[PDB]
Amino acid sequence: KVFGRCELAAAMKRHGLDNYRGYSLGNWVCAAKFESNFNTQATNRNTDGSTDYGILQINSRWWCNDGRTPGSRNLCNIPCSALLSSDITASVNCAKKIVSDGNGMNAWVAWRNRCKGTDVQAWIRGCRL
Ligand code: NA
Ligand SMILES: [Rh+]
Ligand SMILES: [Rh+]
Ligand SMILES: [Rh+]
């Protein structure tokens, strides 16, 4: 599923991301835009052999089992394929563990480089929430 901006914002708010660990909804929407272009099916291979999965490009190195990432952890206790569903519940629940883990949203390279210290409120302007 390729989400609309306001469609995703509404889904993220419902799934408990608005101000999660102090990160406004616009932060999560901006991260999703630059990570996946709002596409639940997005996959990208990392140079280390790990793969990033879904709307927030969660990494098989630490967070999910994809059957092909040797000596990696599965800290969200899920198959990485669960992160590609048109239902974002598994991505949201895993993102909550990631962002709680001490580095906050700096875990997302696209967030640090493209969203951090920007006017992220612009990502939710116009949306019915
Ligand atoms: Na893994
Ligand atoms: Rh939902
Ligand atoms: Rh600003
Ligand atoms: Rh509302």
C-alpha of residue 26 to centroid of ligand 4, in Å: 15
C-alpha of residue 16 to centroid of ligand 1, in Å: 25
Resolution in angstroms comes to 1.7
Q: Find, among 88, 53, 54, the residue nearest to 72 by Cα.
A: 53
Q: Obtained via which technique?
A: X-ray
Q: Find, among 40, 49, 48, 38, the residue nearest to 110 by Cα.
A: 38
Whether 52 is catalytic = yes
Q: Find, among 42, 49, 58, 127, the residue nearest to 93 by Cα.
A: 58
Q: Which domains does the chain have, with CATH numbers?
A: 1-129 (1.10.530.10)
Give the Cα-Cα-Cα angle 5, 93, 105 (nearest 5 degrees): 65
